Design a protein around this ligand. Structure first.
Ligand code: VAV
Lengths: 300, 237
C-alpha cells in the first residue's frame, strides 16, 4: 500500500482520489493520502474552492516512482512531483503517518469498482496519449483539447487519442462505400484493432481512460472519444464475442459510477439510443441496457 | 450550408454546380400476386443531374437489372445515385468538375459525401427549396429514352433548349421550375397547355415547343393559372 504525501494545503480545495473525494480547508494540516492500492493506475484530482474553473489532476502508478504533491503559489496549482531520494521520501511519509496527518484510501473490501473502471488502463498508454516524457505521471485538465478537436490549439498540451472519423478515407474502402459506412466492421477490426491498437485490450484501455477524463474533469473531447469508441463497436456487424461481453461489463460499471446529476452532460442521447436500440449490437449489451433503462430512462 | 431563397442568385454565378435529384432512380409498380399478396415490379429509372446555369442535364438511366438480387432497394438507390454522380465527376475534365453539388433530398447527403471523399474541395449541400424535378419523367422525350433503355446508359440533354440565346439563366430556371411544377400538379392539363396549338412544334433536337417570346408569356400565365386552379381544387378555395 503506497502513499502520496502533500507538502501542505495552502488553498481550500476539493481533492479527488479515484472515485473518492474530500474537502480540505485553507491551511488545514493535511499531508496526503495513504493506503493506495498497488496494481492499478490512479488519479489524484483537484477543484479549488474559490475557482471551480479548470478541474485538473494527475494520472500515476506508485510502482513507477515516489510521487508527492506540492502547491505552487506562482502557477496557482497543486503539482505532482517525483522524489528521487528514496530514503528522504520514506522518512517524510513515516513522520506524517505517525502524526496521522493523512487520509486513508477508503476502499471497501467487497468493492471492485476501481478495478472494473481501469481494467485495461495502463500508465504506458496514458503517457502516449498525454505527452510529457520527463514525468512518470500525466497531467490532465477540463480544457485540454484532443488532436481531433485541433484539426477542426497548442500541440504540447493536447490529448492524443486515436482519431476516429466515420466519414474518412481511413474508414471507407474505395468500392465498398455503402458497405463500410453501414457496417463499420472493416474499420473496427482491420484498421483499428489489427492496425492501430494491435488488440482489444489497448482499445478498451483508451475507451476507459477517455471515460474517466470526461467524468473527473468535464473534458468534452474525452467524452467525444468515449462515445466514438462505443459507436464504432456497436455499428459493426462482426465483433468478437469476447469483446462484446467485455464491452457490456465496461459500460455497465461506467454507467453505474456516473454521478446521477451529471448524466445530462456526460451521456449523448443519439449515440446511446442508436447503440442500444438500432445498432447491430442492440441485443448484445444486456447489462448495460438494463442499468441505463433503470437509471436514466429519460435519456432514452 | 443549405441552399434557400436567401442565396438563390448563387445558382447562376460562374462557379460550376450541379443539382442531383434521386426521386426517379428506384421506380416500381405495386401489384397483387396470384396468392393475393402484394409485390413490386421495378421499372427503369434515372438520376437527374442538372447544371442550372447552362441547362446541361446528365441523365443517367438506371436499368432494372441493377436491382436484381439486391435487398433494401430504397437504401441501395441512394448509394447507387452517389456512386454514379461520383463516377460522372471523375469522368469530367478538372476544369468542368463542379465546385458544389446540391442534393434535392437530405437523405442523399451522407451517401454522396462518402462517395466524394476523394474530392474534399467539392461542397455537398442540401437545399430548402422544394424543387419539382421528380416531374422530369413527364417530359416525353426523357421518359421515352428511360423506358426504352435495355442497359445502363448516360444521355446528355440541354433542358433549356435554345432559351439562353434570348433569356438569362435565372429566367430559364424559373421557366423550367414553373413548367415542371405544373406537370407535377396536373400532368394532363400541363401537357394540354403545351401542345394545344398544333402549329407550334418541338424541334427534333429540343425537349419543349418552339414558342416565341410572346407565346412563352401566354404559356407561363396558363401554367400559373393551372397551379392556382389545382391549389383551389385541392384545398377548396
Ligand atoms: C462541462 N462539460 N463537461 C463535459 C463532459 F465531459 F462531461 F462531457 C462537456 C462539457 B462542456 O461542454 O464544456
Amino acid at each position: 500500500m503506497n502513499t502520496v504525501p502533500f507538502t501542505s494545503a495552502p488553498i481550500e480545495v476539493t481533492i479527488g482520489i479515484d472515485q473518492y473525494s474530500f474537502n480540505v480547508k485553507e491551511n488545514q494540516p493535511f499531508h496526503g493520502i495513504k493506503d493506495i492500492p498497488i496494481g492499478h493506475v490512479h488519479v489524484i484530482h483537484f477543484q479549488h474552492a474559490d475557482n471551480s474553473s479548470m478541474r485538473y489532476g494527475y494520472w500515476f502508478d506508485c510502482r513507477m516512482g515516489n510521487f508527492y504533491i506540492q502547491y505552487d503559489p506562482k502557477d496557482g496549482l497543486y503539482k505532482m512531483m517525483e522524489e528521487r531520494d528514496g530514503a528522504k521520501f520514506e522518512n517524510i511519509v513515516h513522520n506524517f503517518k505517525e502524526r496521522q496527518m493523512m487520509v486513508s484510501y477508503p476502499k471497501i473490501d467487497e468493492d471492485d469498482t476501481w478495478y472494473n473502471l481501469t481494467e485495461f488502463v495502463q500508465m504506458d498508454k496514458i503517457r502516449k496519449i498525454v505527452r510529457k516524457d520527463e514525468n512518470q505521471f500525466s497531467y490532465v485538465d477540463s480544457s485540454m483539447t484532443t488532436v481531433q478537436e485541433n484539426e477542426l490549439s497548442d500541440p504540447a498540451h493536447s490529448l492524443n487519442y486515436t482519431v476516429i472519423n466515420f466519414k474518412s478515407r481511413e474508414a471507407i474502402r474505395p468500392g465498398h462505400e455503402m458497405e463500410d459506412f453501414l457496417d463499420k466492421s472493416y474499420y473496427l477490426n482491420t484498421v483499428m484493432l489489427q492496425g492501430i491498437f494491435k488488440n482489444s485490450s489497448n482499445y478498451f484501455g483508451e475507451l476507459q481512460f477517455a471515460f474517466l477524463n470526461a467524468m473527473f474533469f468535464g473534458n468534452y473531447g474525452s467524452s467525444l472519444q468515449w462515445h466514438a469508441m462505443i459507436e464504432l463497436i456497436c455499428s459493426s456487424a462482426t465483433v468478437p464475442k469476447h469483446m462484446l461481453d467485455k464491452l457490456d461489463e465496461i459500460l455497465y460499471y461506467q454507467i453505474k459510477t456516473l454521478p446521477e446529476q451529471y448524466s445530462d452532460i456526460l451521456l449523448n442521447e443519439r449515440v446511446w439510443n442508436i447503440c442500444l436500440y438500432s445498432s447491430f449490437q442492440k441485443n448484445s449489451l444486456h447489462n448495460t441496457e438494463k442499468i441505463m433503462e433503470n437509471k436514466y430512462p429519460e435519456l432514452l | 450550408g443549405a441552399m434557400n431563397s436567401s442565396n438563390y442568385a448563387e445558382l447562376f454565378n460562374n462557379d460550376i454546380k450541379l443539382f442531383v435529384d434521386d426521386t426517379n432512380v428506384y421506380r416500381v409498380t405495386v401489384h397483387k400476386t396470384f396468392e393475393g399478396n402484394v409485390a413490386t415490379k421495378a421499372i427503369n429509372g434515372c438520376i437527374f443531374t442538372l447544371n442550372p446555369k447552362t441547362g446541361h442535364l446528365f441523365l443517367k438511366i438506371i436499368h432494372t437489372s441493377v436491382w436484381a438480387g439486391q435487398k433494401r432497394l430504397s437504401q441501395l438507390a441512394k448509394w447507387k445515385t452517389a456512386e454514379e454522380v461520383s463516377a460522372l465527376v471523375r469522368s469530367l475534365p478538372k476544369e468542368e468538375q463542379p465546385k458544389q453539388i446540391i442534393v434535392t433530398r437530405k437523405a442523399m447527403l451522407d451517401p454522396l459525401e462518402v462517395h466524394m471523399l476523394d474530392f474534399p474541395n467539392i461542397a455537398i449541400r442540401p437545399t430548402e427549396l422544394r424543387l419539382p424535378f421528380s416531374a422530369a419523367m413527364s417530359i416525353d422525350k426523357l421518359s421515352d429514352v428511360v423506358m426504352k433503355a435495355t442497359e445502363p446508359q448516360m444521355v446528355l440533354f440541354n433542358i433549356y433548349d435554345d432559351w439562353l440565346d434570348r433569356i438569362s439563366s435565372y429566367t430559364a430556371f424559373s421557366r423550367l421550375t414553373l413548367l415542371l411544377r405544373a406537370l407535377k400538379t396536373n400532368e394532363e392539363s400541363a401537357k394540354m397547355i403545351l401542345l394545344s396549338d398544333p402549329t407550334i412544334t418541338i424541334k427534333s433536337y429540343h425537349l419543349w415547343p418552339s414558342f416565341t417570346d410572346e407565346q412563352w408569356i401566354t404559356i407561363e400565365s396558363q401554367m400559373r393559372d393551372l397551379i392556382l386552379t389545382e391549389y383551389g381544387r385541392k384545398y377548396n378555395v
